[PDB]
């Protein structure tokens, strides 16, 4: 018959799937307290202005307040991140692609080599005028003092390396040409798949590769181009991952990891 969440967990437990590629979005960051990027406040021509360069040049204060909130150290990873961390620790993670900019994937312990922050990061920054690169730390203070970072060379605005609309995606994104054909399982956690070219990556896997979606809604290419080995665990993203963790037998090992990695951060 058709594949179920239990059948995919059985495939993982049997080690039939060992090249898992994961795609994640805001659905896995909202349970950690990350605010919705469309509904601010925890100045909008349209919701996407916060990540649009012309507005940013008109008024960059809204983006830099959002950053002061999302900059590392404030929020902390949740169960979904530590599940993916466990996938990596067990040698099953080929690569984790994320649309999120909170850095919680790195904080959960996933090494940068196994991670593709496809929509940029606050760890680096670039001057909007002369393109001079800068370490993300070199501008941290300015954002905490509610300032606007400025280039020490040309006085232009320095922008964290968050990929804005219209901007190219980082170069580590181009690892998708080799990873997705090499994947034997595709997990899609908490994303509406409305942003391209990220969303189109669901189709970059082979039709013999299962695609498991844990998201409140069946969204995007999985709804209009369904495949035989597609599985959809619709509902809350945390409960869906916890159901998969139980079906995998990782509940207690998770409970150990979540308590030890959290206390490490005091």
């Amino acid at each position: 018959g058709k594949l179920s969440l239990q059948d995919v967990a059985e495939l993982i437990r049997a080690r039939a799937c060992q090249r898992v590629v994961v795609m994640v979005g805001a659905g896995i960051s909202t349970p950690s307290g990350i605010p919705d990027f469309r509904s601010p406040g925890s100045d909008l021509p349209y919701p996407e202005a916060i990540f649009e360069l012309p507005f940013f040049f008109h008024n960059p204060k809204p983006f830099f307040t959002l950053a002061k909130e999302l900059y590392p150290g404030n929020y902390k990873p949740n169960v979904t991140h530590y599940f993916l961390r466990l996938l990596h620790d067990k040698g099953l993670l080929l690569r984790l692609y994320t649309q999120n900019i909170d850095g919680l994937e790195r904080v959960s312990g996933i090494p940068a080599s196994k991670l593709v922050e496809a929509h940029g990061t606050f760890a680096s920054a670039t001057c909007t005028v002369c393109q001079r690169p800068f370490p993300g730390e070199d501008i941290r203070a300015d954002v905490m003092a509610d300032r606007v970072p400025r280039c020490p060379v040309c006085t232009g605005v320095v922008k964290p390396d968050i990929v804005f609309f219209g901007e190219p995606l980082p170069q580590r994104f181009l690892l998708h040409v080799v990873d997705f054909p090499m994947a034997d399982l595709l997990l899609i956690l908490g994303t509406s798949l409305e942003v391209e070219p990220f969303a189109s990556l669901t189709e970059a896997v082979r039709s013999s590769v299962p695609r498991l979606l844990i998201n409140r809604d069946l969204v995007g290419p999985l709804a209009w181009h369904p495949r035989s080995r597609d599985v959809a665990q619709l509902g809350d993203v945390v409960h869906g991952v916890e159901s998969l963790v139980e079906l995998l037998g990782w509940t207690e090992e998770m409970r150990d990891l979540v308590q030890r990695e959290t206390g490490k951060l005091d």
Binding site: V163, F165, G166, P168, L169, E194, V195, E196, P197
Partner: peptide, 8 residues
């Protein structure tokens, strides 16, 4: 089609 863009 390598540049970030929303469906709309």
């Amino acid at each position: 089609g390598g540049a970030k863009r929303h469906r709309k």
